[PDB]
Amino acid sequence: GPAFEFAVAMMKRNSSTVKTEYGEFTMLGIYDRWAVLPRHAKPGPTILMNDQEVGVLDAKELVDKDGTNLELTLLKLNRNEKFRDIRGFLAKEEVEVNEAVLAINTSKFPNMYIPVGQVTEYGFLNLGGTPTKRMLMYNFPTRAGQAGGVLMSTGKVLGIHVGGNGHQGFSAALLKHYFN
């Protein structure tokens, strides 16, 4: 319940629905004009954010110190409004919790919240042929179109959902140092 209340408030304050040429995704704004999308959203020079064209001034595909994919792309938007700064909800390291909620908001899944239970730091996954690290894992019946969803627990933003296989979902851990 507390995770759900936290999630609804967080989504209302910091999330949007985004379309890139590669698909439709939930997008979380972090601070200033920096937001995050799963890497496979492959944003171009402009995105559609809540049905409106928004320019992308910079983008950074995140990899670790040895170039290993982290499956996140940070984007700096050409926007006057600043995101409410939620870096205080981002952990310095991968978070494990017993009860989390995954929040999605797209035209396919509007305002939907899913209790996913326990989140575990799984670490390495080969995603489509791409070695990837810092993966958080949780179980629920996954569906296409959920990437970009926000994984949260009471007082914490844990990660961004990047993929699912059957009843297994996974998020890239959303770490504080990615935003300074």
Q: Are residues 72 and 10 in the same domain?
A: no
Given 36, 58, 83, which residue is the final one in a domain? 83
179 phi, psi to nearest 5 deg:
-125, 25
3 DSSP assignment: H
83 DSSP assignment: B
**Closest to 3 in 3D by CA, of 110, 139, 100, 141:** 100
Q: Domain span at residue 106?
A: 1-14+84-180
Cited resolution, angstroms: 1.4
Q: Where are the beta strands (DSSP E) in the chain?
A: 15-20, 23-31, 34-38, 46-49, 52-63, 69-77, 97-104, 112-127, 130-139, 150-153, 156-165, 168-173
Q: Are residues 56 and 108 in the same domain?
A: no
Experimental approach = X-ray
Distance CA 134, CA 56 (A): 26
Q: Please name the amino acid found at residue 115.
A: P
Q: Are residues 102 and 180 in the same domain?
A: yes
Distance CA 175, CA 180 (A): 10
Distance CA 131, CA 154 (A): 30
Count the domains in the chain: 2
Given 36, 61, 83, which residue is the final one in a domain? 83
**Closest to 81 in 3D by CA, of 45, 43, 29:** 29
Given 83, 107, 124, which residue is the final one in a domain? 83
Distance CA 123, CA 55 (A): 33
144 DSSP assignment: T
CATH assignment of the domain containing 180? 2.40.10.10
Count CB atoms within 10 A of the CB of residue 61. 12
Instruction: Give SS3 for 86.
Output: coil
Distance CA 157, CA 150 (A): 7
